Protein backbone atom coordinates (compact mmCIF):
# COMPACT_ATOMS: atom_id res chain seq x y z
CA UNK A 1 0.00 0.00 0.00
CA UNK A 2 1.17 3.86 -0.94
CA UNK A 3 1.50 6.51 2.16
CA UNK A 4 1.66 9.53 2.37
CA UNK A 5 0.99 13.15 3.75
CA UNK A 6 -0.91 16.60 3.16
CA UNK A 7 1.64 18.43 1.98
CA UNK A 8 1.93 22.48 1.45
CA UNK A 9 1.69 24.19 -1.50
CA UNK A 10 2.19 27.76 -0.29
CA UNK A 11 5.52 29.91 -1.46
CA UNK A 12 7.40 30.33 -4.95
CA UNK A 13 7.54 26.21 -5.80
CA UNK A 14 3.62 26.24 -5.88
CA UNK A 15 2.15 22.76 -6.42
CA UNK A 16 5.77 21.75 -7.95
CA UNK A 17 7.12 21.98 -4.56
CA UNK A 18 5.11 19.33 -3.26
CA UNK A 19 5.74 16.63 -5.63
CA UNK A 20 9.48 17.90 -4.95
CA UNK A 21 8.99 17.20 -1.13
CA UNK A 22 6.77 13.99 -1.55
CA UNK A 23 10.45 12.70 -3.48
CA UNK A 24 12.72 14.21 -0.77
CA UNK A 25 10.55 12.56 2.07
CA UNK A 26 10.55 9.10 0.04
CA UNK A 27 6.50 9.63 0.18
CA UNK A 28 4.54 6.75 -2.04
CA UNK A 29 1.58 8.86 -2.47
CA UNK A 30 0.71 12.53 -1.26
CA UNK A 31 -2.28 15.22 -1.11
CA UNK A 32 -2.48 18.87 -1.67
CA UNK A 33 -5.38 21.45 -1.38
CA UNK A 34 -5.96 23.35 -4.31
CA UNK A 35 -6.05 26.80 -2.84
CA UNK A 36 -5.54 28.24 0.54
CA UNK A 37 -8.70 26.37 2.60
CA UNK A 38 -8.88 29.34 5.08
CA UNK A 39 -10.35 31.49 2.10
CA UNK A 40 -12.84 31.20 -0.83
CA UNK A 41 -10.81 32.38 -3.41
CA UNK A 42 -9.78 30.91 -6.51
CA UNK A 43 -5.72 30.08 -6.84
CA UNK A 44 -3.93 30.80 -10.20
CA UNK A 45 -2.78 28.40 -12.19
CA UNK A 46 -0.16 28.89 -14.80
CA UNK A 47 0.37 26.99 -17.96
CA UNK A 48 3.66 26.87 -16.52
CA UNK A 49 2.79 25.44 -13.00
CA UNK A 50 0.63 22.42 -14.50
CA UNK A 51 3.85 21.48 -16.75
CA UNK A 52 6.10 21.28 -13.69
CA UNK A 53 4.21 19.67 -11.76
CA UNK A 54 2.95 17.00 -14.18
CA UNK A 55 6.71 17.02 -15.11
CA UNK A 56 8.18 16.72 -11.42
CA UNK A 57 5.32 13.77 -11.00
CA UNK A 58 5.99 11.88 -13.97
CA UNK A 59 10.08 11.78 -13.47
CA UNK A 60 10.02 10.50 -9.80
CA UNK A 61 7.26 7.95 -9.99
CA UNK A 62 4.03 9.76 -11.01
CA UNK A 63 3.06 9.02 -7.06
CA UNK A 64 -0.76 9.12 -6.84
CA UNK A 65 -2.21 12.37 -5.70
CA UNK A 66 -5.23 14.16 -4.15
CA UNK A 67 -6.44 17.22 -3.54
CA UNK A 68 -8.54 17.85 -0.57
CA UNK A 69 -11.55 20.35 -0.75
CA UNK A 70 -11.34 23.09 1.91
CA UNK A 71 -13.33 22.53 5.24
CA UNK A 72 -15.42 25.67 3.72
CA UNK A 73 -17.12 23.43 1.62
CA UNK A 74 -20.48 22.36 2.29
CA UNK A 75 -22.62 20.62 0.49
CA UNK A 76 -25.47 20.55 2.68
CA UNK A 77 -25.71 23.85 3.14
CA UNK A 78 -29.69 25.07 2.46
CA UNK A 79 -28.31 28.91 2.28
CA UNK A 80 -26.30 30.99 -0.39
CA UNK A 81 -23.43 28.85 1.07
CA UNK A 82 -24.33 25.92 -0.90
CA UNK A 83 -23.31 27.83 -4.29
CA UNK A 84 -20.09 28.95 -2.84
CA UNK A 85 -19.42 25.98 -1.81
CA UNK A 86 -20.29 23.85 -4.73
CA UNK A 87 -18.78 26.22 -7.10
CA UNK A 88 -15.41 26.23 -4.61
CA UNK A 89 -15.14 21.98 -5.00
CA UNK A 90 -15.95 22.30 -8.66
CA UNK A 91 -12.33 24.83 -8.83
CA UNK A 92 -10.92 21.97 -6.88
CA UNK A 93 -12.05 19.30 -9.48
CA UNK A 94 -11.53 21.40 -12.51
CA UNK A 95 -7.98 22.58 -11.12
CA UNK A 96 -7.34 18.45 -10.22
CA UNK A 97 -7.96 17.56 -14.28
CA UNK A 98 -5.50 20.13 -15.52
CA UNK A 99 -2.86 18.50 -12.86
CA UNK A 100 -3.70 14.97 -13.96
CA UNK A 101 -4.78 14.37 -10.47
CA UNK A 102 -7.40 11.59 -10.19
CA UNK A 103 -8.79 12.32 -7.05
CA UNK A 104 -10.31 14.84 -5.04
CA UNK A 105 -11.52 14.02 -1.70
CA UNK A 106 -14.54 16.47 0.40
CA UNK A 107 -16.31 16.10 3.61
CA UNK A 108 -20.04 15.48 3.01
CA UNK A 109 -21.04 18.62 5.05
CA UNK A 110 -24.05 18.97 6.72
CA UNK A 111 -27.52 18.75 6.49
CA UNK A 112 -30.18 16.96 4.40
CA UNK A 113 -28.52 13.93 2.82
CA UNK A 114 -30.29 14.79 -0.46
CA UNK A 115 -28.71 18.32 -0.39
CA UNK A 116 -25.48 17.20 -0.13
CA UNK A 117 -26.10 14.78 -3.15
CA UNK A 118 -27.17 17.70 -5.36
CA UNK A 119 -24.46 19.50 -4.44
CA UNK A 120 -22.22 17.04 -5.19
CA UNK A 121 -23.79 16.21 -8.24
CA UNK A 122 -23.82 19.75 -9.49
CA UNK A 123 -20.12 20.54 -8.82
CA UNK A 124 -18.75 17.74 -11.06
CA UNK A 125 -21.25 18.97 -13.77
CA UNK A 126 -19.77 22.61 -13.53
CA UNK A 127 -16.49 21.19 -13.75
CA UNK A 128 -17.34 19.16 -16.81
CA UNK A 129 -15.95 16.10 -15.43
CA UNK A 130 -15.50 12.80 -16.97
CA UNK A 131 -14.12 9.48 -15.50
CA UNK A 132 -11.11 11.72 -14.44
CA UNK A 133 -10.94 13.20 -11.90
CA UNK A 134 -12.95 11.29 -9.32
CA UNK A 135 -15.08 13.10 -6.76
CA UNK A 136 -14.74 11.10 -2.99
CA UNK A 137 -16.76 11.63 -0.37
CA UNK A 138 -15.36 11.05 3.07
CA UNK A 139 -17.20 9.36 6.29
CA UNK A 140 -17.95 11.39 9.03
CA UNK A 141 -18.22 11.89 13.06
CA UNK A 142 -21.96 12.23 12.67
CA UNK A 143 -23.69 13.59 15.33
CA UNK A 144 -25.63 17.41 14.96
CA UNK A 145 -26.85 17.10 11.24
CA UNK A 146 -23.40 16.19 10.09
CA UNK A 147 -24.05 13.85 6.93
CA UNK A 148 -22.01 10.69 5.80
CA UNK A 149 -21.77 9.10 9.32
CA UNK A 150 -23.03 5.58 8.84
CA UNK A 151 -21.36 3.73 5.70
CA UNK A 152 -24.44 2.32 4.21
CA UNK A 153 -25.82 6.59 3.79
CA UNK A 154 -22.94 6.75 1.64
CA UNK A 155 -23.60 3.96 -0.51
CA UNK A 156 -26.85 5.38 -1.23
CA UNK A 157 -25.09 9.08 -1.65
CA UNK A 158 -23.09 7.87 -4.16
CA UNK A 159 -25.66 5.28 -6.11
CA UNK A 160 -26.11 6.33 -9.40
CA UNK A 161 -23.31 8.60 -10.11
CA UNK A 162 -19.29 8.68 -10.65
CA UNK A 163 -18.71 9.72 -7.16
CA UNK A 164 -16.60 7.16 -5.02
CA UNK A 165 -15.80 6.92 -1.25
CA UNK A 166 -12.66 7.80 1.32
CA UNK A 167 -12.34 6.61 4.34
CA UNK A 168 -11.63 8.01 7.26
CA UNK A 169 -10.48 6.41 10.31
CA UNK A 170 -10.68 9.01 12.93
CA UNK A 171 -14.18 9.93 11.69
CA UNK A 172 -15.17 6.03 11.79
CA UNK A 173 -13.79 5.76 15.18
CA UNK A 174 -15.77 8.57 16.54
CA UNK A 175 -19.40 7.80 14.94
CA UNK A 176 -19.29 4.37 16.45
CA UNK A 177 -17.37 2.12 14.18
CA UNK A 178 -14.47 0.27 16.64
CA UNK A 179 -11.46 0.42 14.71
CA UNK A 180 -9.51 -0.23 17.38
CA UNK A 181 -10.08 -3.23 18.51
CA UNK A 182 -12.14 -4.81 15.30
CA UNK A 183 -10.63 -3.12 12.31
CA UNK A 184 -11.58 -6.22 10.25
CA UNK A 185 -15.11 -5.90 11.25
CA UNK A 186 -15.17 -2.01 10.08
CA UNK A 187 -13.79 -3.03 6.66
CA UNK A 188 -16.26 -5.75 6.87
CA UNK A 189 -19.34 -3.77 7.50
CA UNK A 190 -17.75 -1.05 4.71
CA UNK A 191 -17.24 -3.88 1.91
CA UNK A 192 -20.80 -4.80 2.72
CA UNK A 193 -22.62 -1.16 2.02
CA UNK A 194 -20.32 0.67 -0.04
CA UNK A 195 -18.26 -1.66 -1.36
CA UNK A 196 -14.06 -1.34 -0.98
CA UNK A 197 -13.91 -1.47 -4.93
CA UNK A 198 -15.01 1.88 -4.06
CA UNK A 199 -12.90 3.50 -1.89
CA UNK A 200 -9.29 4.23 -3.80
CA UNK A 201 -7.92 6.36 -0.26
CA UNK A 202 -7.84 6.36 3.07
CA UNK A 203 -7.24 8.75 5.60
CA UNK A 204 -5.71 6.65 8.17
CA UNK A 205 -6.12 9.16 10.85
CA UNK A 206 -5.37 8.07 14.44
CA UNK A 207 -8.36 9.69 17.10
CA UNK A 208 -7.37 11.71 19.86
CA UNK A 209 -12.16 11.27 20.86
CA UNK A 210 -13.27 7.75 22.42
CA UNK A 211 -15.75 5.48 20.44
CA UNK A 212 -18.78 7.35 19.32
CA UNK A 213 -17.65 10.21 20.93
CA UNK A 214 -18.43 12.18 17.51
CA UNK A 215 -15.19 13.92 18.56
CA UNK A 216 -13.11 14.55 15.02
CA UNK A 217 -9.49 15.61 16.15
CA UNK A 218 -6.97 13.26 14.02
CA UNK A 219 -3.86 12.23 15.90
CA UNK A 220 -0.39 10.91 14.82
CA UNK A 221 -0.07 7.43 14.03
CA UNK A 222 0.66 5.29 17.64
CA UNK A 223 -0.68 8.61 19.25
CA UNK A 224 -4.18 8.15 19.50
CA UNK A 225 -7.15 5.58 20.70
CA UNK A 226 -7.03 3.54 17.99
CA UNK A 227 -3.51 2.66 17.55
CA UNK A 228 -2.32 -0.44 15.97
CA UNK A 229 -6.06 -0.69 15.27
CA UNK A 230 -4.62 1.26 12.03
CA UNK A 231 -1.64 -1.08 11.62
CA UNK A 232 -4.57 -3.92 10.54
CA UNK A 233 -6.60 -1.28 8.47
CA UNK A 234 -3.56 -0.09 6.64
CA UNK A 235 -2.50 -4.08 5.92
CA UNK A 236 -5.93 -5.63 5.14
CA UNK A 237 -5.24 -7.71 1.98
CA UNK A 238 -8.08 -6.02 0.67
CA UNK A 239 -6.62 -2.62 0.52
CA UNK A 240 -2.88 -3.54 0.07
CA UNK A 241 -3.33 -1.69 -3.94
CA UNK A 242 -4.77 1.30 -2.29
CA UNK A 243 -3.73 4.94 -1.12
CA UNK A 244 -3.38 5.90 2.60
CA UNK A 245 -2.88 9.30 3.77
CA UNK A 246 -2.40 10.77 6.82
CA UNK A 247 -4.13 14.02 7.80
CA UNK A 248 -2.09 15.26 11.11
CA UNK A 249 0.31 18.36 12.16
CA UNK A 250 3.58 18.86 9.96
CA UNK A 251 6.80 19.21 10.59
CA UNK A 252 10.60 17.33 11.00
CA UNK A 253 9.80 15.27 14.33
CA UNK A 254 6.21 14.41 13.82
CA UNK A 255 7.32 13.66 10.10
CA UNK A 256 9.80 11.40 11.18
CA UNK A 257 7.48 9.42 13.11
CA UNK A 258 4.97 8.73 11.16
CA UNK A 259 6.94 7.71 8.33
CA UNK A 260 9.34 5.67 10.41
CA UNK A 261 5.33 3.72 11.76
CA UNK A 262 4.71 3.82 8.32
CA UNK A 263 7.54 1.67 6.94
CA UNK A 264 7.71 -0.27 9.96
CA UNK A 265 4.29 -1.43 9.23
CA UNK A 266 4.63 -1.65 5.76
CA UNK A 267 7.87 -4.60 6.36
CA UNK A 268 5.11 -6.38 7.95
CA UNK A 269 3.13 -6.59 4.48
MN1 LIG B 1 -11.45 15.11 10.32
Known sequence: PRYGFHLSIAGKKGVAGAVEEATALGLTA???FAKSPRSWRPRALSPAEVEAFRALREA????????????????????????????????????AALLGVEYVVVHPGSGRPERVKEGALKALRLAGVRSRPVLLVENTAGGGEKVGARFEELAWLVADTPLQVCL?????????????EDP??????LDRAVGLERVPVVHLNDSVGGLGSRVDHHAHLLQGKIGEGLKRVFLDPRLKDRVFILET???????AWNLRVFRAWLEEA
Open 168 to 180: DTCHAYAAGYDVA
Open 249 to 255: PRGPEED
Open 30 to 32: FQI
Open 60 to 95: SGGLPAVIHASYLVNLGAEGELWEKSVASLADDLEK
Open 184 to 189: LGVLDA
